[model samples]
Target: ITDMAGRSVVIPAKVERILLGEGRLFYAVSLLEGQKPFDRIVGWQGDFRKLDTQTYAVYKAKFPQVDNIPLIISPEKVLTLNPDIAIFGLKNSELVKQLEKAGVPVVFVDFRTSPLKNTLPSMRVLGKVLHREQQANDYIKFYEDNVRKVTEITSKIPADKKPSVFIELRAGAMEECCGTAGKGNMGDFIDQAGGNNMAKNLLPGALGTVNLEKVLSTNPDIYIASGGKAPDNNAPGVSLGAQVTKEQAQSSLQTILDRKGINTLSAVKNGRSYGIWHNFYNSPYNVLAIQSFAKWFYPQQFADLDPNNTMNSLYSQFLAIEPTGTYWVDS
Candidate 1:
């Protein structure tokens, strides 16, 4: 079947050995693989543990072998693992060429570059490759249903009525003033949730850093910050995710907003500020992010939307582990 990258590739009849280009891709794979999410995974990028340790710790507790998975997967490393197929986030021609030249079957599934347009297709591709189409279809249906609830209503929202939003992507993750999504990924989530992204017109690419002055000048109607539990507890980012407490997340957000000029923003003054897990930008569970954003953007219009219930349903229906701690928080 054709992968998300518009490339035609041959898939194995039974994919027992799987190699993930990005460790976080397991978020979608967990939904399709059922009880033993990492059963077929042989190796993956090592960033998962370094970036989102809160979630990594939760999964590690449930799946002990997670530590046994290989971290390096170069051409030589790929040859040694001899995976049946390699699933990559996007097409990395140089690495793909090396892997392909080594006779490795490679397919692409992107959740980063253009998540909104490609998440469903990428999941379907994963389903076909992993031979878990039924599970994929089930999750996809649930995702669509939840997303439709927001889009059906938000799509009708007039341009003027759509609240302007400035989403600080990875809020304090970097030392820069602000990092934000533009044309794709979280930008798409903002659009679907009935919020006009303040950086949409400023950024030339999907993601970029914007100046603090620009954000202050815009003074968007709503402010959304994205962050996750950094490996270091003392890290200067909003701590949010599976193992992070509500108070911890809220406190982290408060510290971020306490920045000199940021504290003066109208959104901050009006208490229209919110924070969400940063990993949702690259996960199939982004539906929760969209719903949460919708609720935040227009509480009166989406009074009945319950992202918490949706998160519970998602975990109960498909995930191998239960959700704990805070993922989204009111600031």
Candidate 2:
């Protein structure tokens, strides 16, 4: 099968060992693999277990084998593990050359970086590689259906009516002044969800800092805080995830709101602030985040669209484990 990056990936005829690359491709594989996703995997980048520790702990409790899986730290482990096939995200050509030298077939799946442009085709590629075409089609249909439901409605709004959004890249996880997404990541989805990304005008790359004074002057209509795990509790950035609770997320938001001049904004004073998981930019399930943005920006139009319900349904109907933690919160 041809990968999203145009690499020709050979699938093993008979079942054998598989290696997970880029650490986060598990988001797509976990849904397709019923229980015990570690069955075919020899080793992985081991990002989910560390980055999204809260959600990782859920699956870890259900399948302790998850704890035993080796993290593909050094390439030496790659040779020892000796997977028959390697599955990766964001391909590294030099690494690809090394893998084929070991006689391993490489396949790629991308759900991040170019998520809006690449994820669907990548999902189709993964379905064929895993021989889960039916499952993949089902998920793809669900993905498209949800995607159009939002786009169909949001697309009709006039430019004058679009809300402007300012996102706090990492709320409580860092002490840095300001970080905002530009294009091809959160900014892309924010545009898809019918909001103007203020950062697109302020930042030149996918990630850059917007001047605090500039943010105050422009005063976006909505203020969003993206959360993730840090080195520790006081590490900085908004904190929200499997282990982070509603109270904790809100507390983090309040702390940010109290930051220099943030409280004076109308979005804060009028109570329009919100928080969401930072991983949305990297996950295939980012529809939930887009839905959240749409609902937030134009509540009357997407009022019936429940991102939480859709999020739960995807897990309950397809995934091995049903997620119970807070993914996002209203601040």
Candidate 3:
């Protein structure tokens, strides 16, 4: 058994009742063990309404009782649930400690920011804790295979030909953007995928918010928008080669172009803009993002590749469902 301090406080044969402290845990668990195992979940700390709606709907339909657990904000509620095991992401470190003091068994998993090499180990850890070692091994094998495939494809591309890219995180209101993975982040995927990050000159760490002037100075060959609907939200629209009609994408680009110094950038003029799922920056789904990016950045070099088909196939093969409309868009 684990304690709230994110440490193993005791050992049990199994954890029959579990509480999920973060949404990524749900995604990771669903991918590893399939939906039926989620019936064992006793509660969650946040609302499922904001997550991928299709996944939420299917899980909710099969396990209506699971949704009855309220969004946990207080330790008292966690105690009331009396979960045999508690799971948390990096963001809940302090709370894990508090729960430990209250004598709740918690196991902390770092899903937020870690190198890709660490993902398999994390899956193994979760699998071991949940007593689903075989299922976890299957997932690990699949994940590693995809990683290998992606690396192989990227290896063929020449270093100088690699495109420089900027990843925009948000548009309007707060209006923010970040560039490349720093040091040990997903930006490594860009390198592995044979692309240079325009934001490399900036500091290393999670994306720091930057203005259009800085982005223009970087002069990236490709601009990737994340964090909102595609095609209409500063990201490429669905349909790949088709025209973009999504209002969110249009509004975001307009905001970028409206900026005083952004027009000088080549990506805006050449229309090398693209949009991907909002979670591209961090998530187990990042493998898909890496594949999609390689196809986008090197279409001629990877002409035989089909990123869209590959993406949908991965979703169906791993997540057991078809990807619905407009997950990735061309801008």
Candidate 4:
């Protein structure tokens, strides 16, 4: 089978053990593995717990043995776990070379960099490699249907009618002016939702920083900040993700808008600002993110589109756990 990076790899006869290079891949794995998601995962990167502690706690509560899963430190540590297959979204050349030399197959599946272009194919690769073809197809069907619903409407919108959007990535993670999606990930979602992304050509990659003056000059039609809970309870930033309340998320978003220059953006002045979970940028559940973007971009046109209903159906139909807490909030 071929990986997302176009690398061809031989598959194991009967796959058993698995290693995840990025802990966030659990979102996709859990969808396929059902209730026994962790049974095959031997190890994973540390970011999942460290970056999104609230969501990790939700999973840990259900599977107490999650703490016992080892952290991936090196190629040697990966081999020690005896994993038959190791999955990664981002690649470390040396690690990939070392792991493959030892007979463990490494496969890449990305949902972050260019979600609009790669999400469906990446999910298909994962399903084929993991022998979860049925589950993958099920999700692809739902994702395509939801995406088409928004696209079918947005496709008819004239360029002049579409709103210009400025989406701040990890909104309050830093005190700097702004970090935003360029032409991929969130940027793609913005365009798909019938909005003109302010940073579409400003940066050369999926994400980068844009100065305050530039943001003020452009004055996008809508402002959206993305962030999640920090590991520290008293940390000051956007409070979003599982278990976070709408009030908490809204209050945190206020801090960003309260910034000296940011407060003056036309979007903020007119109450056209919002906040969303940071993790949605890289999850297969990104359909929800696109839906939310469409609604925010053209509330009157998309009045019948309910992202909450889409989210609820996704959780109940496929996820091992039920949905809880706030994932997005309006100003």
lDDT of 2 by residue, 1-331 (tens): 8887787877677545777776678888776776657688778886877787877887888888888888875686577877777888763666678898998888877766677887788878878787677878888999899889799988898888899888877764334556778876788778889999888877666767777777788888999988876324776667777677777777776887777678888888888888878888788888888888998898899888998788888987678886776777887
The Cα local distance difference test for each model comes to: 0.87, 0.79, 0.61, 0.86
Off by over 4 Å in 1: 91-94, 173-175, 230-232
What does each candidate score in C-alpha RMSD? 1.6, 2.2, 4.6, 1.5
Q: Candidate 2's error at 161, in angstroms?
A: 0.9
Runs of candidate 2 exceeding 4 Å displacement: 91-94, 173-175, 230-232
TM-scores of all predicted structures: 0.96, 0.92, 0.80, 0.96
Candidate 1: worst-modelled 10 consecutive residues by lDDT? 72-81
User: Which ten-residue region of model 2 has the weakest summed lDDT?
Assistant: 169-178
lDDT order of candidates, top first: 1, 4, 2, 3
Write one digit per residue (lDDT tens) for candidate 3, span 49-150: 354444465556656765666566576666677777777765566666766776666666654356455556667677777777787788778767766766
By the lDDT metric, which is better: model 3 or model 4? 4
State the displacement of the C-alpha of residue 130, model 2, in Å, after optimal TM-score superposition.
2.0
Q: Whose lDDT is greatest here?
A: 1
* Residues 170-213 of candidate 4: C-alpha lDDT, one tens digit per residue: 87645576889998988988988999999998999998899978
Q: Give one clash count per candidate, in the order shown.
A: 0, 9, 19, 0
Per residue, candidate 1 scores C-alpha lDDT tens digits across 211-235 of 9999999999999888886534786
